[PDB]
């Protein structure tokens, strides 16, 4: 039934209806048997299969399943703890969702391969969203802030150490008794340590997540950026101890890339996280297309102008690189229309320059602005959903890292009694509690667990 | 925009400054001077050969082009697009906020001139 669902309205409606009917029939015929726990060869259950395959409707039905039939009510996953006026308090099951199982629904959704249809939207189902927000509010936000602060300190130390590098001679540079030299050496050691730390963290990420090639290209951008920064740092160290003076280039690239990577920590804040998501989307689409076309035009006109120039009779503009740079200066508002005179035909030269200026400056750039406007208009909500995924991944990673400090101390929900199993024993579940208000219903005849409305 | 732009500007300024050796405008081996030189790019006055005191020209030019592409071609146009979206979104809220501003002005003016006319200018009849 899960395999047949395809997220359309009628298909989803019937799949849910038949799922419920078969569940009820199985409960009546074989009360002892637990149908939803059975697994296929891959080991997935109907819930895990639905979560992984991207069947949003079936997942939403399952997580909020509520059965009021007295004989078969333990099958429900949502319960009403109490109601006084228009106020209701409901409980969600969290049986196989709280990351305390082999592969919970939350982990399965978070670590998808981006091939699954709509993984962005599967975290909007009430229990998952509220659970993630609770986990963020309780303990992980402080850890994220601590990590951000430590990274800021690391970058400041790296910048200070690189600023005061020795300039006389070749590396390695001998230590001196000056206190400033000791501080500089300490900073260099700390920078190298941070680089190796990021290297190993990237390695372990690759090992654990076993990303696919296409996934490696299209999903893990931040991981790749941090890994590349660490690679630059390590290559810089290698060159430094090889007595080559080229280690400065690698160190500078690492410094700049780390300062840019500082942008990763904007996902702990809604506004800045959404802004960074939009930045990513623009870079991926608009910059790529515009740069392809612009580079084609620039190279064509640069070659034309270079071949026109004779350089007989800045100087020596008869170089492809120099002419390309001169034409690129036009894009940034610094173009000189008389940058050379070493040519025979002024009409040809000026016509070429004006054609380039009109094609690239007046048309392509403004068109890029318009396309960016359209893209901004189009991706208002997808950006928020992608930011939610980013924060969820951060939450899961943080919770996995600190198993030793608190393996189960910070566990969501609380153990509550929901009812009685048909065998007559008690039903105890790790439930997550929510509150709601409804003014239209005014239903005074429903199923409740507690006589007294309030909680403690 | 200013938060992101300042992050990028400081990172690339530090990179370029550490690349410069200043051996062999002058004395560009200053963080302030390099920051100003990179900021000039934003206002359409950036010089791609503002110094030659370095050992590796390719690294310098690559850094400058990366900065220019990231901040000039991407961030500014994106700011324009975001401004357009914001303008589209706040058409009526702006009028309502202006109405509040004028109402506050009215109340303050009426309170200030109690002595001149305590109840002479009273609305209704
Ligand atoms: C090159 C272009 C790559 C830029 C891509 C980019 O923006 O992804 C940002 C970079 O976050 C920074 O680390 C901040 C980096 C901002 C862009 C920096 C510019 C590139 C470095 C240039 C250094 C120049 C020095 C030489 C973070 O994505 P990310 O790993 O959380 O991946 C998310 C998310 O996790 C996935 O689920 C989504 O499927 C995926 O689409 C994506 O939204
Ligand atoms: C000391 C405590 C170290 C662990 C904290 C931590 O995870 O920070 C880390 C920063 O810190 C470092 O990586 C630098 C480590 C060297 C510290 C020297 C400077 C001291 C001032 C926090 O960073 P992270 O969240 O591990 O990863 C962020 C980027 N990925 C890997 C998630 C993509
Ligand atoms: C957390 C806090 C981190 C903030 C840290 C540092 C920021 C403040 C730096 C002020 C230093 C002034 C002294 C001075 O000019 O002489 C310099 C000594 O300065 C040093 O060596 C200090 C650098 C060490 C930084 C590592 C921190 C690790 C600690 C854990 C050498 O003499 P100079 O001739 O000035 O150098 C010429 C260099 N230029 C100007 C030509 C480029
Ligand atoms: C170093 C440690 C940092 C100190 C924590 C500051 C704090 O505590 O305040 C937050 C600030 O406000 C903001 O949004 C944006 C301001 C911070 C942006 C800096 C980006 C860093 C790169 C709550 O932000 P928030 O999640 O959007 O608020 C909740 C949300 O608005 C509900 O709608
Ligand atoms: C060479 C650049 C080609 C980029 C084209 C592109 O946007 O592909 C996107 C992926 O681009 C890549 O392959 C990036 C490769 C790794 C870069 C990390 C540093 C596809 O994503 P989408 O469907 O646009 O969302
Ligand atoms: C020149 C340097 C920068 C960019 C050049 C190539 C970018 C063209 C891709 C634009 C269309 C696109 O995003 O394809 C979408 C994604 O397709 C891909 O994943 C293929 C990207 C490989 C590009 C080489 C569709
Ligand atoms: C978008 C288009 C990208 C690439 C198209 C590749 C076509 C290259 C045609 C070669 C033109 C040519 O002969 O340029 C020669 C090579 O020019 C260069 O510096 C490298 C050219 C590679 C261009 C790739 C971008 C003459 O320059 P030289 O030998 O360094 O100095 C002469 C004394
Ligand atoms: C489009 C507008 C076409 C108007 C261009 C003609 C202006 C003056 C042409 C002229 O006198 O230069 C003449 C131009 O040389 C040529 O053979 C090319 C003429 C340019 C027309 C090409 C239009 C096709 C686009 C040569 O005289 P000089 O030795 O430069 O003295
Ligand atoms: C956008 C266009 C902006 C400015 C273009 C200048 C306006 C055309 C005036 C034509 C007068 C003319 O041909 O002057 C002659 C000189 O003309 C030239 O050297 C080349 C004229 C070609 C300009 C038209 C090309 C437009 C095509 C764009 C595609 C003789 O006067 P002199 O050289 O000052 O001694
Ligand atoms: C966005 C980022 C904002 C602030 C990040 C703070 C990190 C600062 C790292 C310190 C780099 C450093 O050592 O620069 C030193 C200090 O540079 C300065 O002028 C003040 C730096 C404060 C930057 C805050 C913005 C070397 O300059 P000096 O000692 O005046 O002249 C040398 C003869
Ligand atoms: C992106 C495009 C990267 C391709 C640009 C490399 C072309 C020239 C490299 C070159 O000449 O290396 C020479 C030495 O440069 C270096 O030591 C490192 C080269 C940096 C290229 C790799 C950067 C990857 C980002 C040029 O400097 P020189 O010794 O003054 O002569
Ligand atoms: C946007 C790009 C606009 C302009 C870039 C210039 C076009 C590349 C032409 C490559 C020829 C080349 O490597 O020339 C050589 C010189 O190259 C250099 O000095 C550094 C070349 C690196 C430019 C490519 C960096 C793009 C990466 C951006 C991120 C030898 O010719 P010469 O030094 O004139 O004597
Ligand atoms: Na200009």
Curated annotation (Swiss-Prot), chain A:
Query: Quick one: effect of changing residue 341 to Q?
Result: Minor modification of pore attributes
Instruction: Give TM regions.
Output: 143-163, 182-207, 221-241, 246-266, 282-309, 348-376
Q: What is the effect of changing residue 326 to Q?
A: Slight modification of pore attributes
**Tell me, what controls this protein's activity?**
Channel activity is activated via the interaction with PIRT and phosphatidylinositol 4,5-bisphosphate (PIP2). Both PIRT and PIP2 are required to activate channel activity. The channel is sensitized by ATP binding. Repeated stimulation with capsaicin gives rise to progressively smaller responses, due to desensitization. This desensitization is triggered by the influx of calcium ions and is inhibited by elevated ATP levels. Ca(2+) and CALM displace ATP from its binding site and trigger a conformation change that leads to a closed, desensitized channel.
Q: How does it sit in the membrane?
A: Multi-pass membrane protein
The outcome of changing residue 257 to L is: Reduces binding to resiniferatoxin
Cell compartments where the protein resides: Postsynaptic cell membrane; Cell projection, Dendritic spine membrane; Cell membrane
User: Which windows of the sequence hold ANK repeats?
Assistant: 1-31, 45-68, 103-125
Q: In which tissues is it expressed?
A: Predominantly expressed in trigeminal and dorsal root sensory ganglia. Expressed also in hippocampus, cortex, cerebellum, olfactory bulb, mesencephalon and hindbrain. High expression in the cell bodies and dendrites of neurons in the hippocampus and in the cortex. In the brain detected also in astrocytes and pericytes (at protein level). Isoform 1 and isoform 3 are expressed in brain and peripheral blood mononuclear cells.
The GO cellular component terms are:
dendrite; dendritic spine membrane; external side of plasma membrane; GABA-ergic synapse; membrane; neuron projection; neuronal cell body; plasma membrane
Motif position, Selectivity filter: 333-336
Q: What's the impact of mutating residue 394 to A? A: No effect on PMA-induced enhancement of capsaicin-evoked currents but reduces direct activation by PMA
| Intramembrane positions | 317-339
- Residues binding Na(+) 2, per UniProt: 333
Residues that bear Phosphoserine: 212
Q: Which reaction does it catalyse?
A: Ca(2+)(in) = Ca(2+)(out); Mg(2+)(in) = Mg(2+)(out); Na(+)(in) = Na(+)(out); K(+)(in) = K(+)(out)
Function of this protein?
Non-selective calcium permeant cation channel involved in detection of noxious chemical and thermal stimuli. Seems to mediate proton influx and may be involved in intracellular acidosis in nociceptive neurons. Involved in mediation of inflammatory pain and hyperalgesia. Sensitized by a phosphatidylinositol second messenger system activated by receptor tyrosine kinases, which involves PKC isozymes and PCL. Activation by vanilloids, like capsaicin, and temperatures higher than 42 degrees Celsius.
Q: What else is on record for this protein?
A: Responses evoked by capsaicin, but not by low pH and heat, can be antagonized by capsazepine.
Q: Tell me which family the UniProt entry assigns to this protein.
A: Belongs to the transient receptor (TC 1.A.4) family. TrpV subfamily. TRPV1 sub-subfamily.
Q: Which comment does the entry carry about domains?
A: The association domain (AD) is necessary for self-association.
Q: How does it assemble?
A: Homotetramer. Interacts with PIRT. May also form a heteromeric channel with TRPV3. Interacts with CALM, PRKCM and CSK. Interacts with PRKCG and NTRK1, probably by forming a trimeric complex. Interacts with the Scolopendra mutilans RhTx toxin. Interacts with the spider Tau-theraphotoxin-Hs1a. Interacts with TMEM100. Interacts with PACS2.
This protein is called Transient receptor potential cation channel subfamily V member 1
Name of the gene this protein is made from: Trpv1
Parent-record interval covered: 291 to 766 of 838
């Amino acid at each position: 039934l899960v395999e047949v669902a395809d997220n359309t309205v009628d298909n989803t409606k019937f799949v849910t209806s038949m799922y419920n009917e078969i569940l009820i029939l199985g409960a009546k015929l074989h009360p002892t048997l637990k149908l939803e726990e059975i697994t296929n060869r891959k080991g997935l259950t109907p819930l895990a299969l639905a979560a992984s395959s991207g069947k949003i409707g079936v997942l939403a039905y399952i997580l909020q399943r509520e059965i009021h039939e007295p004989e078969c009510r333990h099958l429900s996953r949502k319960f009403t703890e109490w109601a006084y006026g228009p106020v209701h308090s409901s409980l969600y099951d969290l049986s196989c969702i709280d990351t305390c199982e082999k592969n919970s629904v939350l982990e399965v959704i978070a670590y998808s391969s981006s091939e699954t249809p709509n993984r962005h939207d599967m975290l909007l189902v009430e229990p998952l969203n509220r659970l993630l927000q609770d986990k963020w509010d309780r303990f992980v936000k402080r850890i994220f802030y601590f990590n951000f602060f430590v990274y800021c300190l690391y970058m400041i130390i790296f910048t200070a150490a690189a600023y005061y590098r020795p300039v006389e001679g070749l590396p390695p540079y001998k230590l001196k008794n000056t206190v400033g030299d000791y501080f500089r050496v300490t900073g260099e050691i700390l920078s190298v340590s941070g680089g190796v730390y990021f290297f190993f963290r990237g390695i372990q990420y690759f090992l654990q997540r076993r990303p696919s090639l296409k996934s490696l290209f299209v999903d893990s951008y931040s991981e790749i950026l941090f890994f590349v920064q660490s690679l630059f740092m390590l290559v810089s160290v290698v060159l430094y101890f090889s007595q080559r003076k080229e280690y400065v280039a690698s160190m500078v690239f690492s410094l700049a890339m780390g300062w840019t990577n500082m942008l990763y920590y904007t996902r702990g804040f809604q506004q800045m996280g959404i802004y960074a998501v939009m930045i990513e989307k623009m870079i991926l689409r608009d910059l790529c297309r515009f740069m392809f076309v612009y580079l084609v035009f620039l190279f064509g006109f640069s070659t034309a102008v270079v071949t026109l120039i004779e350089d007989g009779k800045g100087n020596s503009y008869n170089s492809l690189y120099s002419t390309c740079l001169e034409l690129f200066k036009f894009t940034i508002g610094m173009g000189d229309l008389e940058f050379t005179e070493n040519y025979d035909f002024k009409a040809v030269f000026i016509i070429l320059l004006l054609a380039y200026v009109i094609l690239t400056y007046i048309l392509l750039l403004n068109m890029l602005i318009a396309l960016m406007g359209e893209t901004v208009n189009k991706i208002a909500q997808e950006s928020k959903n992608i930011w939610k995924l980013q924060r969820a991944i951060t939450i899961l990673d943080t919770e996995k890292s600190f198993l030793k400090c608190m393996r189960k101390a910070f566990r969501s929900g609380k153990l509550l009694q929901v009812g009685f199993t048909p065998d007559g024993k008690d039903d105890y579940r790790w439930c997550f509690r929510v509150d709601e208000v409804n003014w239209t219903t005014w239903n005074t005849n429903v199923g409740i667990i507690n006589e007294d409305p309030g909680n403690c």
